[PDB]
UniProtKB/Swiss-Prot annotation:
Name listed for the protein in its UniProt record: Guanine-N7 methyltransferase nsp14
Chain residues that bind S-adenosyl-L-methionine: 274-280
Record's catalysed reaction(s): a 5'-end (5'-triphosphoguanosine)-ribonucleoside in mRNA + S-adenosyl-L-methionine = a 5'-end (N(7)-methyl 5'-triphosphoguanosine)-ribonucleoside in mRNA + S-adenosyl-L-homocysteine
Positions of Zn(2+) 15 binding: 200, 204, 207, 222
Gene: rep
Regulation: Inhibited by Remdesivir antiviral drug (GS-5734).
Positions of region (GpppA-binding): 355-369
Function: Plays a role in viral RNA synthesis through two distinct activities. The N7-guanine methyltransferase activity plays a role in the formation of the cap structure GpppA-RNA. The proofreading exoribonuclease reduces the sensitivity of the virus to RNA mutagens during replication. This activity acts on both ssRNA and dsRNA in a 3'-5' direction.
Lineage: Viruses, Riboviria, Orthornavirae, Pisuviricota, Pisoniviricetes
Top-level taxon of origin: Viruses
Length: 459
């Protein structure tokens, strides 16, 4: 059951307004033929243009919502909309382009998909709410065949050029005019009652319906993300490394240890309440503090209400000592908190647009994160950058320029001059810090936090 069988049935009720008289009995095999494509009994890596819900989830980075609305179809101009916000008008002679023939439209399609996807995925998955015109328009910009490799590199081919008769990946397709071996999934096959807008609107208020094709394309991808990552969650699906995943995760571990260790030294809390990851390990193993864990899986729909996490009868007194919320998204943090909250607004190669203001953060696993809300942090302040170290000033073992910084909290800086070891360690920590912030993470701390209290931990 690796791929979707072409002999699987396709429900055609959603297609009968654009395609009147369409047979109720229909397979993927007959549908692909009707779309103007011939598979020719080919056992060459592309068994079906359509993929399963499971194959779509594994390739969520390739998702591009796609919708076609008739402006007037052979004789009528078509508005092609994409979840990138692009609308192209194809004549058969929220960006909006005037009517142009297919030979030029197809060039823009390849450019747009290559620019959006080259740093996300090795393919494209057209996410549909199929009504007919999107399927019958595919023959105008899509070519299919055996699985091929790029002419300039080892990646799989996603584009084709009729000018040079060659194939390219998303990185080497400039001047290419055809989308080659794309994938697609019709969301309507999943079993829904009512139209696209009524299902999308049940879960999302951030996307509206301006009655343009890109609005429907955006709503379609959003509904698919809601079904696959919000109501249904799967943390056993691994996703390939496409960027700074390892560095970001290593930086997050360094920053957490640094910030918690300093908070414990500066304010000497007798107890720490560690809320979140059921598999968490103490991030400051040598700390004196009474470490107490509370299990909460990552919330993928709405942020946790602090009243439900803490109340309904544990030290019971979460007001004692400090609360650590490391990527545990709550509606309103208590004043005695140390917090790391992912900022969904920072779109990235890792961070894909999500449902209802939220975002799909994909780093090893897929994590749909509720929309960032500045009001969650009203009892706290932004944590300032600082580097703290109690390790001995000793080199052991890249060159040197003397470091001068008021935020290098070390015995050597207290004593007047930062040693080479702490200067190297400071610069590496600052790099890790900037990496985490730029990846989208935001750090918040209790208002009384003051690094001035760390200088006296050198006595
Ligand atoms: C920064 C940015 O625009 N990201 C992005 C990534 C993937 C898709 C799919 N549809 N719209 C998208 C947008
Ligand atoms: C150098 C150092 O002490 N680092 C550190 C950082 C995080 C964790 C978590 N568990 N043990 C840790 C140790
Ligand atoms: Zn290439
Ligand atoms: Zn939406
Ligand atoms: Zn030093």
């Amino acid at each position: 059951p690796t791929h979707l069988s072409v002999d699987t049935k396709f429900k055609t009720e959603g297609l009968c307004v654009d395609i009147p008289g369409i047979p109720k009995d229909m397979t993927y095999r007959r549908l692909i033929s009707m779309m103007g494509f011939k598979m020719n009994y080919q056992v060459n890596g592309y068994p079906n243009m359509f993929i399963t819900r499971e194959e779509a989830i594994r390739h969520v980075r390739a998702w591009i919502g796609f919708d076609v609305e008739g402006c007037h179809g052979t004789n009528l101009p078509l508005q092609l909309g994409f979840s990138t916000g692009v609308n192209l008008v194809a004549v058969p002679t929220p960006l909006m382009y005037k009517g142009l023939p297919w030979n030029v439209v197809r060039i823009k399609i390849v450019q747009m998909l290559s620019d959006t996807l080259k740093n996300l995925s090795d393919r494209v998955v057209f996410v549909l709410w199929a009504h007919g015109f999107e399927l019958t328009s595919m023959k105008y910009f899509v070519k299919i065949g055996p699985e091929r490799t790029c002419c300039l590199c080892d990646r799989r081919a996603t584009c084709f050029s009729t000018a040079s008769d060659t194939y390219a990946c998303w990185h080497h397709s400039i001047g290419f005019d055809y989308v080659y071996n794309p994938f697609m999934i019709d969301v309507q096959q999943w079993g829904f009652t009512g139209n696209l807008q009524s299902n999308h609107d049940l879960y999302c208020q951030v996307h509206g319906n301006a009655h343009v094709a890109s609005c429907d394309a955006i709503m379609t991808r959003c509904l698919a993300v809601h079904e696959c990552f919000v109501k249904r969650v799967d943390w056993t699906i691994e996703y390939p490394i496409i960027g700074d995943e390892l560095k970001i995760n290593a930086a997050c571990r360094k920053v957490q240890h640094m910030v918690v260790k300093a908070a414990l030294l500066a304010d000497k809390f007798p107890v720490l309440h560690d809320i979140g990851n059921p598999k968490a390990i103490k991030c400051v193993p040598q700390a004196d503090v009474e470490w107490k864990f509370y299990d909460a899986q990552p919330c993928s729909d709405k942020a946790y209400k602090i009243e439900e996490l803490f109340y309904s009868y544990h030290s019971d007194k979460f007001t004692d000592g400090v609360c650590l919320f490391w990527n545990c998204n709550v509606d309103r943090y208590p004043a005695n908190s140390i917090v790391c909250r992912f900022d969904t607004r920072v779109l990235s190669n890792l961070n894909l647009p999500g449902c209802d203001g939220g975002s799909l953060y994909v780093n090893k696993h897929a994590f749909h994160t509720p929309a960032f809300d500045k009001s969650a942090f009203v009892n706290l302040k932004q944590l300032p950058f600082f580097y703290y170290s109690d390790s001995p000033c000793e080199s052991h073992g890249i060159d040197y320029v003397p470091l001068k910084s008021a935020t290098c909290i070390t015995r050597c800086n207290l004593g007047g001059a930062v040693c080479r070891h702490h200067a190297n360690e400071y610069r590496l920590y600052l790099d890790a810090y900037n990496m985490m912030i730029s990846a989208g993470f935001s750090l918040w701390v209790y208002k009384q936090f003051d690094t001035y209290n760390l200088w006296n931990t050198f006595t």
